[PDB]
C-alpha cells in the first residue's frame, strides 16, 4: 500500500481533487488506498471509487477496441504481414485492463461486499462485480471465458434479486444495474431477447413509480430511463 | 456501443 | 531502458498504434525507446516523438492549472483551512510534469540536438527545447525561475536565427516556432509588445510567400497563420 | 489560453 501512510480523509479529499482535474488513475489509486483502510464506504465514497475505476477501465476498453480492430484487419485475406507488433501491443493493453479489473474485483472481495448489508451498498458493489467481470469477458477467449461470463451473470443476478426486494423500481442503482445487466445479455451472453425484455420491463415499472418522486429524484431516475430507451431504440 | 452507467 | 530489447522499427510501429488508440503515455515511452537506439530521427519519427510528449505534458499542464486554481482560492481571505492536501497534490502533479519535461530535455541533449545538422531537424529540436523549458517555467517559483526562462529564451532564439537563415517564411516549423516564442514572450517573459510584434511580422512575411506554395503546402501554412491571427485577436 | 503548436 503506497497510500498506507496517508490519512483516510486526505485520500478522499485528494480523490475529489483528482476528479476535478480529470486525473482518474490518481483518483482510483487514492480510492484504493481509502478502501484499504478497512472501514466501510459511505454513499459518496462508493461513487468516488466507482467513477474512478469506470473512467480508467473505460479508456482501456476504448484503446483495446481500436487495437483489436486493427489486428482483425491485419488478419483479413489480402493483408500484408506486419509482424507480431499489433498482437503484442493489443496484448499489452489487454493485460493492463485485466489488471485493473482484478484490482477492483479484489477490493470488492476484500472486504467490501462481505461487510455490505444495506441494499444501497450491497447492490452497488454486486453491480460493480458484474461490470468488472463483464469487462474481463469482453477480452476473454480461453478455457476461462465461460466461467468469467458466469461470474458476471451470478453477481448481476444476486444484485437484481436484492434490488427487486429492497428498492423501489425508480431507484437509480436498481435502474443502472438493469441497464448494464441488459447490455451483458445483449453483448456478452448472446441473449438479445433477454436484453430487450429486461430493458422494457425495467422502463415500464419505473414509469409507473415516477409519481412518488420529488423533482430531483425524478430527474435522476428519468435520466437512466432514457438510457434504457436509447438501448431499446438501438436494438429494435 | 450501447449505454451503460 | 525498458524498451532496450525491442527493435527500433517495432517501437516506431507501436508508437503509431498508440497514437491511433490515444495512448499517449505509451506512445512517448515507445518513442523514447526509439531515440535511445542512438540513430537520428526521420521527419515522421521526430513528429511522433513531439506529438507523444506534447499530449502527455499537455494533460499534466491542464491538471496543474485546475489544482493551482483551487489552491489559490483556498488561500484567499475568508477561506476555510482545508489542510495541506491541495498543495500536496498540486506538488505531486507538478513533480510528475517536471519529470516528463526533464526526460524530453534529456533526449534532446543526449544526443538529438548535437547530431542535428539540417535546418528541419535542428530548428524542430531547438523549438522543442524552448517549449519544454517554457513548461518548466510555467510552474517555476524558486531561485531557478529566471534561469529556466533564460534557457527557454536561448533555445527559441537559436531556433529563430537558424529558421530565418535557412527556411522560407511559410515553413510550418518556422511558423510554429514563432507562434510559440510569441506565447513565451506574452505569458512567460512579461513582454506582450514583443509577443504581438513577433506574431504580426511572422504573419505578414508568411502572407507574402504563400504565392510560391502548392495547394497542400498552402493549407499547412495558412493553418498556423490562423493561429497567429487568433492570438493577435486575443491580445489586441 | 493562447494557441501553441
Ligand atoms: N462523482 C462524485 N464526486 C460524486 C457522486 C455522488 C453520487 C451520490 C449519489 C448517487 C450517485 N450516483 C448513483 O447512485 C448512480 O449513478 C447515477 C447515474 C445517473 C443518474 C443518477 C445516478 C446510480 C447508477 C449506478 F450505475 F449505480 C452508478 C451510480 C452519485 C456524490 S459525489
Ligand atoms: N502524428 C503523426 N503520425 C505524423 C505527423 C507527421 C508530420 C509530417 C510533416 C510535418 C508535420 N508537422 C509539422 O511539421 C508541425 O506541425 C504542423 C502543425 C500544423 C500544420 C502543419 C504542421 C510544424 C509546426 C510544429 F510546431 F513544429 C509542429 C510540427 C507532421 C507525419 S506522421
Short mmCIF file of C-alpha atoms and ligand atoms in Angstrom, two decimals:
data_model
loop_
_atom_site.label_atom_id
_atom_site.label_comp_id
_atom_site.label_asym_id
_atom_site.label_seq_id
_atom_site.Cartn_x
_atom_site.Cartn_y
_atom_site.Cartn_z
CA UNK A 1 0.00 0.00 0.00
CA UNK A 2 1.76 3.11 -1.28
CA UNK A 3 -1.15 5.07 0.27
CA UNK A 4 -0.76 3.32 3.60
CA UNK A 5 0.79 6.36 5.28
CA UNK A 6 -1.88 8.85 4.13
CA UNK A 7 -4.95 9.64 6.23
CA UNK A 8 -8.24 8.19 5.03
CA UNK A 9 -9.81 11.66 4.94
CA UNK A 10 -6.86 13.03 2.94
CA UNK A 11 -7.19 10.22 0.39
CA UNK A 12 -10.89 11.04 -0.07
CA UNK A 13 -10.07 14.75 -0.38
CA UNK A 14 -7.43 14.05 -2.99
CA UNK A 15 -9.74 11.70 -4.91
CA UNK A 16 -12.16 14.63 -5.26
CA UNK A 17 -9.33 16.91 -6.41
CA UNK A 18 -8.17 14.29 -8.92
CA UNK A 19 -11.73 14.08 -10.26
CA UNK A 20 -11.85 17.85 -10.78
CA UNK A 21 -8.50 17.60 -12.62
CA UNK A 22 -9.69 14.59 -14.71
CA UNK A 23 -6.80 12.55 -13.26
CA UNK A 24 -8.72 9.32 -12.96
CA UNK A 25 -5.74 6.97 -12.50
CA UNK A 26 -4.73 9.07 -9.47
CA UNK A 27 -8.36 9.12 -8.30
CA UNK A 28 -8.51 5.34 -8.44
CA UNK A 29 -5.24 4.98 -6.54
CA UNK A 30 -6.48 7.34 -3.83
CA UNK A 31 -9.78 5.45 -3.50
CA UNK A 32 -8.00 2.07 -3.42
CA UNK A 33 -5.97 3.47 -0.55
CA UNK A 34 -9.16 4.58 1.19
CA UNK A 35 -10.80 1.16 0.79
CA UNK A 36 -7.67 -0.49 2.19
CA UNK A 37 -8.10 1.45 5.44
CA UNK A 38 -10.67 -1.23 6.20
CA UNK A 39 -13.71 0.91 7.04
CA UNK A 40 -16.97 0.70 5.14
CA UNK A 41 -17.57 3.32 2.46
CA UNK A 42 -20.27 5.96 2.59
CA UNK A 43 -22.54 6.67 -0.40
CA UNK A 44 -20.30 9.48 -1.66
CA UNK A 45 -17.17 7.37 -1.18
CA UNK A 46 -18.65 4.38 -3.06
CA UNK A 47 -19.38 6.65 -6.01
CA UNK A 48 -15.88 8.14 -5.94
CA UNK A 49 -14.49 4.62 -6.12
CA UNK A 50 -16.77 3.63 -8.99
CA UNK A 51 -16.29 6.82 -11.02
CA UNK A 52 -12.51 6.48 -10.80
CA UNK A 53 -12.22 2.89 -11.98
CA UNK A 54 -15.04 3.25 -14.53
CA UNK A 55 -13.06 6.03 -16.22
CA UNK A 56 -9.74 4.18 -16.08
CA UNK A 57 -11.12 0.93 -17.47
CA UNK A 58 -13.31 2.81 -19.94
CA UNK A 59 -10.24 4.34 -21.53
CA UNK A 60 -8.52 0.96 -21.60
CA UNK A 61 -11.55 -0.61 -23.25
CA UNK A 62 -11.66 2.09 -25.92
CA UNK A 63 -7.97 1.58 -26.68
CA UNK A 64 -8.35 -2.22 -26.75
CA UNK A 65 -11.20 -1.88 -29.27
CA UNK A 66 -9.08 0.29 -31.58
CA UNK A 67 -6.20 -2.19 -31.44
CA UNK A 68 -8.42 -5.28 -31.80
CA UNK A 69 -9.99 -3.72 -34.88
CA UNK A 70 -6.56 -3.10 -36.41
CA UNK A 71 -5.49 -6.63 -35.51
CA UNK A 72 -8.56 -8.16 -37.16
CA UNK A 73 -7.91 -6.23 -40.38
CA UNK A 74 -4.28 -7.40 -40.40
CA UNK A 75 -5.72 -10.94 -40.41
CA UNK A 76 -8.08 -10.49 -43.38
CA UNK A 77 -7.44 -12.13 -46.75
CA UNK A 78 -5.08 -9.83 -48.67
CA UNK A 79 -3.34 -8.05 -45.79
CA UNK A 80 0.43 -7.58 -45.78
CA UNK A 81 2.06 -9.35 -42.83
CA UNK A 82 3.10 -6.63 -40.40
CA UNK A 83 4.68 -8.98 -37.86
CA UNK A 84 3.80 -9.52 -34.21
CA UNK A 85 3.58 -5.88 -33.12
CA UNK A 86 -0.18 -5.30 -33.34
CA UNK A 87 -0.89 -8.50 -31.41
CA UNK A 88 1.82 -7.69 -28.86
CA UNK A 89 0.54 -4.19 -28.19
CA UNK A 90 -3.11 -5.30 -28.03
CA UNK A 91 -1.97 -7.95 -25.53
CA UNK A 92 -0.13 -5.28 -23.50
CA UNK A 93 -3.23 -3.12 -23.21
CA UNK A 94 -5.37 -6.20 -22.53
CA UNK A 95 -3.11 -7.32 -19.68
CA UNK A 96 -3.22 -3.84 -18.14
CA UNK A 97 -7.03 -3.82 -18.40
CA UNK A 98 -7.26 -7.28 -16.82
CA UNK A 99 -5.03 -5.99 -14.05
CA UNK A 100 -7.30 -3.06 -13.27
CA UNK A 101 -10.36 -5.33 -13.30
CA UNK A 102 -8.64 -7.79 -10.97
CA UNK A 103 -7.71 -4.92 -8.64
CA UNK A 104 -11.30 -3.70 -8.41
CA UNK A 105 -12.64 -7.24 -8.00
CA UNK A 106 -10.07 -7.78 -5.27
CA UNK A 107 -11.28 -4.72 -3.37
CA UNK A 108 -14.88 -5.91 -3.64
CA UNK A 109 -13.83 -9.35 -2.35
CA UNK A 110 -11.56 -7.95 0.41
CA UNK A 111 -13.80 -6.95 2.03
CA UNK A 112 -16.37 -4.52 0.69
CA UNK A 113 -19.11 -6.98 -0.32
CA UNK A 114 -18.94 -9.15 2.79
CA UNK A 115 -19.43 -6.11 5.08
CA UNK A 116 -22.18 -4.54 2.93
CA UNK A 117 -25.58 -5.19 4.48
CA UNK A 118 -27.73 -2.28 3.36
CA UNK A 119 -29.32 -2.63 -0.06
CA UNK A 120 -27.80 0.60 -1.41
CA UNK A 121 -24.28 -0.61 -0.63
CA UNK A 122 -24.64 -4.31 -1.35
CA UNK A 123 -26.48 -3.88 -4.67
CA UNK A 124 -23.98 -1.16 -5.68
CA UNK A 125 -20.99 -3.44 -5.04
CA UNK A 126 -22.53 -6.52 -6.66
CA UNK A 127 -23.32 -4.40 -9.76
CA UNK A 128 -19.63 -3.34 -9.85
CA UNK A 129 -18.64 -7.01 -9.56
CA UNK A 130 -20.83 -7.88 -12.55
CA UNK A 131 -19.47 -4.89 -14.50
CA UNK A 132 -15.79 -5.77 -13.99
CA UNK A 133 -16.34 -9.44 -14.81
CA UNK A 134 -18.20 -8.20 -17.90
CA UNK A 135 -15.12 -6.19 -18.91
CA UNK A 136 -12.95 -9.28 -18.39
CA UNK A 137 -15.43 -11.21 -20.56
CA UNK A 138 -15.12 -8.66 -23.38
CA UNK A 139 -11.45 -9.67 -23.87
CA UNK A 140 -11.66 -13.32 -22.81
CA UNK A 141 -11.01 -16.12 -25.30
CA UNK A 142 -9.59 -19.09 -23.34
CA UNK A 143 -10.63 -22.05 -21.19
CA UNK A 144 -11.97 -19.49 -18.68
CA UNK A 145 -14.32 -17.39 -20.82
CA UNK A 146 -17.45 -19.31 -19.88
CA UNK A 147 -16.57 -19.12 -16.20
CA UNK A 148 -15.91 -15.36 -16.42
CA UNK A 149 -19.30 -14.88 -18.09
CA UNK A 150 -20.98 -16.94 -15.40
CA UNK A 151 -19.23 -14.93 -12.67
CA UNK A 152 -20.62 -11.73 -14.20
CA UNK A 153 -24.09 -13.29 -14.52
CA UNK A 154 -24.04 -14.53 -10.92
CA UNK A 155 -23.07 -11.15 -9.47
CA UNK A 156 -25.67 -9.29 -11.54
CA UNK A 157 -28.33 -11.84 -10.57
CA UNK A 158 -27.69 -11.53 -6.84
CA UNK A 159 -27.80 -7.74 -7.21
CA UNK A 160 -31.05 -7.98 -9.19
CA UNK A 161 -32.68 -10.22 -6.60
CA UNK A 162 -31.81 -7.85 -3.73
CA UNK A 163 -32.82 -4.75 -5.69
CA UNK A 164 -36.26 -6.12 -6.52
CA UNK A 165 -36.90 -6.98 -2.87
CA UNK A 166 -35.41 -3.89 -1.22
CA UNK A 167 -35.54 -0.94 -3.63
CA UNK A 168 -38.30 0.88 -5.48
CA UNK A 169 -38.34 0.45 -9.26
CA UNK A 170 -37.11 4.03 -9.77
CA UNK A 171 -34.05 3.67 -7.53
CA UNK A 172 -31.12 4.83 -9.72
CA UNK A 173 -28.85 1.98 -8.60
CA UNK A 174 -31.57 -0.53 -9.45
CA UNK A 175 -32.08 1.19 -12.82
CA UNK A 176 -28.38 1.30 -13.68
CA UNK A 177 -27.96 -2.32 -12.64
CA UNK A 178 -30.78 -3.35 -15.00
CA UNK A 179 -29.37 -1.21 -17.81
CA UNK A 180 -25.97 -2.88 -17.50
CA UNK A 181 -27.30 -6.44 -16.98
CA UNK A 182 -29.37 -5.91 -20.12
CA UNK A 183 -26.20 -4.94 -22.00
CA UNK A 184 -24.50 -8.04 -20.56
CA UNK A 185 -27.30 -10.15 -22.06
CA UNK A 186 -27.05 -8.46 -25.47
CA UNK A 187 -23.28 -8.09 -25.89
CA UNK A 188 -21.79 -10.91 -23.76
CA UNK A 189 -24.34 -13.69 -23.27
CA UNK A 190 -25.78 -13.77 -26.83
CA UNK A 191 -29.26 -13.24 -25.35
CA UNK A 192 -30.68 -10.20 -27.16
CA UNK A 193 -34.27 -11.16 -26.36
CA UNK A 194 -33.48 -11.24 -22.64
CA UNK A 195 -31.70 -7.89 -23.00
CA UNK A 196 -34.73 -6.30 -24.67
CA UNK A 197 -37.24 -7.82 -22.21
CA UNK A 198 -35.25 -6.66 -19.21
CA UNK A 199 -34.83 -3.09 -20.53
CA UNK A 200 -38.52 -2.80 -21.42
CA UNK A 201 -39.86 -4.22 -18.14
CA UNK A 202 -37.42 -2.05 -16.14
CA UNK A 203 -38.51 1.07 -18.05
CA UNK A 204 -42.24 0.36 -17.65
CA UNK A 205 -42.05 -0.43 -13.92
CA UNK A 206 -40.04 2.74 -13.33
CA UNK A 207 -42.53 4.83 -15.32
CA UNK A 208 -45.34 3.68 -13.01
CA UNK A 209 -43.39 4.73 -9.87
CA UNK A 210 -42.28 8.21 -11.01
CA UNK A 211 -45.37 9.79 -9.40
CA UNK A 212 -43.91 9.10 -5.95
CA UNK A 213 -40.73 11.11 -6.52
CA UNK A 214 -39.53 14.60 -5.78
CA UNK A 215 -38.35 16.75 -8.69
CA UNK A 216 -34.70 15.95 -8.00
CA UNK A 217 -35.31 12.20 -7.72
CA UNK A 218 -37.44 12.35 -10.87
CA UNK A 219 -34.55 13.91 -12.82
CA UNK A 220 -32.13 11.16 -11.75
CA UNK A 221 -34.49 8.28 -12.50
CA UNK A 222 -35.65 9.66 -15.84
CA UNK A 223 -32.02 10.14 -16.92
CA UNK A 224 -31.34 6.43 -16.65
CA UNK A 225 -34.77 5.54 -18.07
CA UNK A 226 -33.72 7.49 -21.17
CA UNK A 227 -30.61 5.31 -21.45
CA UNK A 228 -32.85 2.21 -21.31
CA UNK A 229 -34.97 3.72 -24.12
CA UNK A 230 -31.83 4.60 -26.09
CA UNK A 231 -30.68 0.99 -25.98
CA UNK A 232 -34.13 -0.30 -26.89
CA UNK A 233 -34.09 2.03 -29.92
CA UNK A 234 -30.66 0.70 -30.90
CA UNK A 235 -31.87 -2.90 -30.63
CA UNK A 236 -35.32 -2.78 -32.28
CA UNK B 1 -21.95 0.66 -28.40
CA UNK B 2 -24.95 0.58 -26.05
CA UNK B 3 -25.22 2.72 -22.98
CA UNK B 4 -24.05 1.58 -19.52
CA UNK B 5 -23.72 3.57 -16.30
CA UNK C 1 15.80 1.21 -20.91
CA UNK C 2 12.71 -0.98 -20.58
CA UNK C 3 12.45 -0.73 -24.39
CA UNK C 4 16.06 -1.76 -24.86
CA UNK C 5 15.15 -5.24 -26.09
CA UNK C 6 12.58 -4.09 -28.68
CA UNK C 7 13.54 -3.40 -32.30
CA UNK C 8 13.67 0.23 -33.36
CA UNK C 9 11.18 -0.41 -36.17
CA UNK C 10 8.81 -2.18 -33.76
CA UNK C 11 8.93 0.77 -31.35
CA UNK C 12 8.02 3.16 -34.18
CA UNK C 13 5.22 0.84 -35.30
CA UNK C 14 3.84 0.65 -31.78
CA UNK C 15 4.09 4.43 -31.33
CA UNK C 16 1.79 4.79 -34.36
CA UNK C 17 -0.61 2.21 -32.90
CA UNK C 18 -0.58 4.00 -29.55
CA UNK C 19 -1.40 7.26 -31.34
CA UNK C 20 -4.40 5.66 -33.05
CA UNK C 21 -5.54 4.37 -29.63
CA UNK C 22 -4.94 7.79 -27.96
CA UNK C 23 -2.47 6.11 -25.58
CA UNK C 24 -0.01 8.96 -25.49
CA UNK C 25 1.97 7.86 -22.41
CA UNK C 26 2.68 4.57 -24.21
CA UNK C 27 3.47 6.49 -27.41
CA UNK C 28 6.01 8.61 -25.55
CA UNK C 29 7.62 5.57 -23.96
CA UNK C 30 7.92 3.86 -27.35
CA UNK C 31 9.46 6.97 -28.93
CA UNK C 32 11.88 7.43 -26.01
CA UNK C 33 12.97 3.86 -26.65
CA UNK C 34 13.44 4.65 -30.34
CA UNK C 35 15.53 7.75 -29.61
CA UNK C 36 17.70 5.72 -27.23
CA UNK C 37 18.66 3.40 -30.09
CA UNK C 38 21.08 6.19 -30.96
CA UNK C 39 20.18 6.79 -34.62
CA UNK C 40 18.96 10.12 -35.93
CA UNK C 41 15.20 10.53 -36.36
CA UNK C 42 13.45 10.99 -39.67
CA UNK C 43 10.82 13.70 -40.20
CA UNK C 44 7.95 11.32 -39.38
CA UNK C 45 9.77 9.98 -36.32
CA UNK C 46 10.51 13.49 -34.97
CA UNK C 47 6.81 14.30 -35.19
CA UNK C 48 5.83 11.06 -33.46
CA UNK C 49 8.15 11.99 -30.61
CA UNK C 50 6.79 15.52 -30.35
CA UNK C 51 3.11 14.56 -30.62
CA UNK C 52 3.51 11.99 -27.84
CA UNK C 53 5.17 14.22 -25.27
CA UNK C 54 3.08 17.27 -26.22
CA UNK C 55 -0.06 15.31 -25.37
CA UNK C 56 1.34 13.87 -22.13
CA UNK C 57 2.61 17.20 -20.83
CA UNK C 58 -0.48 18.99 -22.14
CA UNK C 59 -2.68 16.86 -19.92
CA UNK C 60 -0.37 17.43 -16.97
CA UNK C 61 -0.47 21.18 -17.55
CA UNK C 62 -4.26 21.19 -17.68
CA UNK C 63 -4.44 19.26 -14.41
CA UNK C 64 -1.84 21.52 -12.76
CA UNK C 65 -3.89 24.59 -13.73
CA UNK C 66 -7.05 23.15 -12.17
CA UNK C 67 -5.22 22.34 -8.94
CA UNK C 68 -3.33 25.66 -8.81
CA UNK C 69 -6.63 27.49 -9.21
CA UNK C 70 -8.15 25.54 -6.32
CA UNK C 71 -5.04 26.17 -4.23
CA UNK C 72 -5.16 29.92 -4.86
CA UNK C 73 -8.81 30.07 -3.79
CA UNK C 74 -8.01 28.15 -0.59
CA UNK C 75 -5.55 30.99 0.15
CA UNK C 76 -8.00 33.89 -0.32
CA UNK C 77 -9.27 35.96 2.60
CA UNK C 78 -12.24 34.09 4.08
CA UNK C 79 -11.41 30.52 3.03
CA UNK C 80 -11.73 27.65 5.49
CA UNK C 81 -8.37 25.95 6.10
CA UNK C 82 -8.53 22.61 4.31
CA UNK C 83 -5.06 21.46 5.38
CA UNK C 84 -2.08 20.52 3.24
CA UNK C 85 -3.83 18.26 0.74
CA UNK C 86 -4.40 20.70 -2.14
CA UNK C 87 -0.78 21.88 -2.00
CA UNK C 88 0.48 18.30 -1.71
CA UNK C 89 -1.48 17.06 -4.69
CA UNK C 90 -0.60 20.09 -6.83
CA UNK C 91 3.04 19.41 -5.91
CA UNK C 92 2.64 15.75 -6.91
CA UNK C 93 1.33 16.65 -10.36
CA UNK C 94 3.96 19.39 -10.69
CA UNK C 95 6.79 16.96 -9.89
CA UNK C 96 5.47 14.48 -12.46
CA UNK C 97 5.26 17.26 -15.07
CA UNK C 98 8.81 18.41 -14.29
CA UNK C 99 9.89 14.81 -14.68
CA UNK C 100 8.40 14.50 -18.15
CA UNK C 101 9.96 17.81 -19.19
CA UNK C 102 13.35 16.72 -17.87
CA UNK C 103 13.02 13.43 -19.77
CA UNK C 104 12.33 15.20 -23.07
CA UNK C 105 15.08 17.75 -22.46
CA UNK C 106 17.43 14.87 -21.68
CA UNK C 107 16.65 13.19 -25.00
CA UNK C 108 17.28 16.45 -26.86
CA UNK C 109 20.61 16.84 -25.01
CA UNK C 110 21.61 13.16 -25.43
CA UNK C 111 22.07 13.40 -28.32
CA UNK C 112 19.41 14.62 -30.73
CA UNK C 113 20.40 18.29 -30.97
CA UNK C 114 24.13 17.74 -31.28
CA UNK C 115 23.66 15.37 -34.27
CA UNK C 116 21.02 17.56 -35.97
CA UNK C 117 22.57 19.49 -38.84
CA UNK C 118 19.74 20.05 -41.29
CA UNK C 119 17.52 23.05 -40.59
CA UNK C 120 14.31 21.00 -40.44
CA UNK C 121 15.72 18.77 -37.70
CA UNK C 122 17.79 21.29 -35.76
CA UNK C 123 15.10 24.00 -35.68
CA UNK C 124 12.48 21.36 -34.75
CA UNK C 125 14.54 20.13 -31.78
CA UNK C 126 15.52 23.60 -30.56
CA UNK C 127 11.83 24.61 -30.67
CA UNK C 128 11.03 21.53 -28.51
CA UNK C 129 13.80 22.59 -26.11
CA UNK C 130 12.25 26.05 -25.79
CA UNK C 131 8.77 24.54 -25.36
CA UNK C 132 9.76 22.17 -22.53
CA UNK C 133 11.73 24.85 -20.69
CA UNK C 134 8.65 27.06 -21.14
CA UNK C 135 6.53 24.37 -19.44
CA UNK C 136 9.06 24.19 -16.60
CA UNK C 137 8.85 28.00 -16.35
CA UNK C 138 5.05 27.87 -16.03
CA UNK C 139 5.41 26.08 -12.66
CA UNK C 140 8.72 27.58 -11.51
CA UNK C 141 8.88 29.81 -8.43
CA UNK C 142 12.36 29.37 -6.89
CA UNK C 143 15.96 30.54 -7.21
CA UNK C 144 15.97 28.91 -10.66
CA UNK C 145 12.97 30.53 -12.35
CA UNK C 146 14.98 33.24 -14.10
CA UNK C 147 17.48 30.69 -15.36
CA UNK C 148 14.70 28.41 -16.65
CA UNK C 149 13.17 31.36 -18.50
CA UNK C 150 16.53 32.25 -19.99
CA UNK C 151 17.09 28.62 -21.07
CA UNK C 152 13.75 28.72 -22.92
CA UNK C 153 14.61 32.09 -24.47
CA UNK C 154 18.05 30.90 -25.57
CA UNK C 155 16.74 27.76 -27.27
CA UNK C 156 13.95 29.66 -29.05
CA UNK C 157 16.42 32.34 -30.15
CA UNK C 158 18.88 29.87 -31.68
CA UNK C 159 15.97 28.18 -33.46
CA UNK C 160 14.71 31.56 -34.71
CA UNK C 161 18.13 32.56 -36.02
CA UNK C 162 18.54 29.30 -37.98
CA UNK C 163 14.96 29.38 -39.29
CA UNK C 164 15.31 32.90 -40.67
CA UNK C 165 18.53 31.97 -42.47
CA UNK C 166 17.56 28.52 -43.75
CA UNK C 167 13.77 28.29 -44.15
CA UNK C 168 11.17 30.20 -46.13
CA UNK C 169 8.76 32.33 -44.10
CA UNK C 170 5.91 29.89 -44.76
CA UNK C 171 7.77 26.83 -43.47
CA UNK C 172 5.39 25.28 -40.88
CA UNK C 173 8.19 24.60 -38.38
CA UNK C 174 9.32 28.22 -38.67
CA UNK C 175 5.71 29.37 -38.25
CA UNK C 176 5.02 27.16 -35.22
CA UNK C 177 8.29 28.21 -33.63
CA UNK C 178 7.32 31.88 -33.98
CA UNK C 179 3.81 31.19 -32.68
CA UNK C 180 5.21 29.54 -29.55
CA UNK C 181 8.06 32.03 -28.98
CA UNK C 182 5.43 34.77 -29.21
CA UNK C 183 3.41 33.00 -26.50
CA UNK C 184 6.61 32.69 -24.44
CA UNK C 185 7.01 36.48 -24.66
CA UNK C 186 3.38 37.13 -23.66
CA UNK C 187 2.83 34.53 -20.94
CA UNK C 188 6.33 33.88 -19.51
CA UNK C 189 8.61 36.84 -20.19
CA UNK C 190 6.12 39.66 -19.44
CA UNK C 191 6.80 41.07 -22.92
CA UNK C 192 3.37 41.41 -24.58
CA UNK C 193 4.61 44.01 -27.06
CA UNK C 194 7.34 41.64 -28.26
CA UNK C 195 4.75 38.86 -28.48
CA UNK C 196 2.44 40.98 -30.64
CA UNK C 197 5.25 42.29 -32.87
CA UNK C 198 6.60 38.80 -33.49
CA UNK C 199 3.16 37.34 -34.32
CA UNK C 200 2.32 40.20 -36.68
CA UNK C 201 5.65 40.23 -38.53
CA UNK C 202 5.58 36.42 -38.84
CA UNK C 203 2.03 36.52 -40.25
CA UNK C 204 2.80 39.29 -42.76
CA UNK C 205 6.03 37.70 -44.05
CA UNK C 206 4.24 34.38 -44.48
CA UNK C 207 1.35 36.03 -46.34
CA UNK C 208 3.80 37.42 -48.90
CA UNK C 209 5.33 33.96 -49.56
CA UNK C 210 2.10 31.97 -49.94
CA UNK C 211 2.14 32.51 -53.73
CA UNK C 212 5.09 30.12 -54.02
CA UNK C 213 3.29 27.15 -52.46
CA UNK C 214 1.38 24.15 -53.70
CA UNK C 215 -2.19 23.67 -52.52
CA UNK C 216 -1.14 21.19 -49.83
CA UNK C 217 1.69 23.41 -48.54
CA UNK C 218 -0.68 26.38 -48.60
CA UNK C 219 -3.17 24.54 -46.36
CA UNK C 220 -0.48 23.74 -43.78
CA UNK C 221 0.99 27.24 -43.66
CA UNK C 222 -2.37 29.00 -43.56
CA UNK C 223 -3.47 26.77 -40.67
CA UNK C 224 -0.69 28.06 -38.46
CA UNK C 225 -1.09 31.62 -39.79
CA UNK C 226 -4.67 31.43 -38.50
CA UNK C 227 -3.35 30.53 -35.04
CA UNK C 228 -1.09 33.62 -35.17
CA UNK C 229 -4.16 35.71 -36.07
CA UNK C 230 -6.18 34.05 -33.30
CA UNK C 231 -3.59 35.06 -30.73
CA UNK C 232 -3.34 38.58 -32.11
CA UNK C 233 -7.13 38.86 -31.77
CA UNK C 234 -6.91 37.65 -28.17
CA UNK C 235 -4.20 40.21 -27.38
CA UNK C 236 -5.48 43.37 -29.10
CA UNK D 1 -5.07 30.35 -23.13
CA UNK D 2 -3.33 31.31 -26.38
CA UNK D 3 -2.62 28.86 -29.14
CA UNK D 4 0.65 26.91 -29.43
CA UNK D 5 1.57 24.05 -31.75
N1 LIG E 1 -18.58 11.84 -8.62
C1 LIG E 1 -18.75 12.40 -7.30
N2 LIG E 1 -17.94 13.18 -6.75
C2 LIG E 1 -19.99 12.08 -6.54
C3 LIG E 1 -21.06 11.25 -6.98
C4 LIG E 1 -22.09 11.21 -5.88
C5 LIG E 1 -23.37 10.42 -6.01
C6 LIG E 1 -24.30 10.49 -5.00
C7 LIG E 1 -25.48 9.76 -5.11
C8 LIG E 1 -25.71 8.96 -6.24
C9 LIG E 1 -24.76 8.92 -7.24
N3 LIG E 1 -24.89 8.10 -8.43
C10 LIG E 1 -25.60 6.84 -8.44
O1 LIG E 1 -26.11 6.38 -7.46
C11 LIG E 1 -25.54 6.09 -9.78
O2 LIG E 1 -25.25 6.94 -10.87
C12 LIG E 1 -26.29 7.72 -11.40
C13 LIG E 1 -26.23 7.98 -12.76
C14 LIG E 1 -27.24 8.73 -13.34
C15 LIG E 1 -28.26 9.23 -12.55
C16 LIG E 1 -28.31 9.00 -11.18
C17 LIG E 1 -27.31 8.23 -10.59
C18 LIG E 1 -26.72 5.14 -9.96
C19 LIG E 1 -26.47 4.21 -11.12
C20 LIG E 1 -25.16 3.45 -11.00
F1 LIG E 1 -24.94 2.69 -12.12
F2 LIG E 1 -25.25 2.62 -9.91
C21 LIG E 1 -23.97 4.38 -10.79
C22 LIG E 1 -24.26 5.27 -9.60
C23 LIG E 1 -23.57 9.61 -7.12
C24 LIG E 1 -21.75 12.01 -4.76
S1 LIG E 1 -20.30 12.68 -5.05
N1 LIG E 2 1.32 12.37 -35.93
C1 LIG E 2 1.87 11.55 -36.97
N2 LIG E 2 1.73 10.31 -37.05
C2 LIG E 2 2.64 12.20 -38.07
C3 LIG E 2 2.90 13.58 -38.21
C4 LIG E 2 3.72 13.79 -39.46
C5 LIG E 2 4.17 15.15 -39.93
C6 LIG E 2 4.85 15.26 -41.12
C7 LIG E 2 5.27 16.51 -41.54
C8 LIG E 2 5.02 17.64 -40.76
C9 LIG E 2 4.34 17.50 -39.58
N3 LIG E 2 4.06 18.61 -38.68
C10 LIG E 2 4.92 19.75 -38.56
O1 LIG E 2 5.94 19.86 -39.17
C11 LIG E 2 4.48 20.76 -37.48
O2 LIG E 2 3.11 20.67 -37.16
C12 LIG E 2 2.19 21.26 -38.05
C13 LIG E 2 1.04 21.76 -37.47
C14 LIG E 2 0.09 22.37 -38.28
C15 LIG E 2 0.30 22.43 -39.65
C16 LIG E 2 1.44 21.90 -40.24
C17 LIG E 2 2.40 21.30 -39.43
C18 LIG E 2 5.02 22.17 -37.77
C19 LIG E 2 4.83 23.06 -36.56
C20 LIG E 2 5.46 22.47 -35.30
F1 LIG E 2 5.18 23.27 -34.22
F2 LIG E 2 6.81 22.42 -35.48
C21 LIG E 2 4.96 21.06 -35.01
C22 LIG E 2 5.19 20.20 -36.24
C23 LIG E 2 3.94 16.25 -39.12
C24 LIG E 2 3.96 12.57 -40.17
S1 LIG E 2 3.29 11.36 -39.32
#
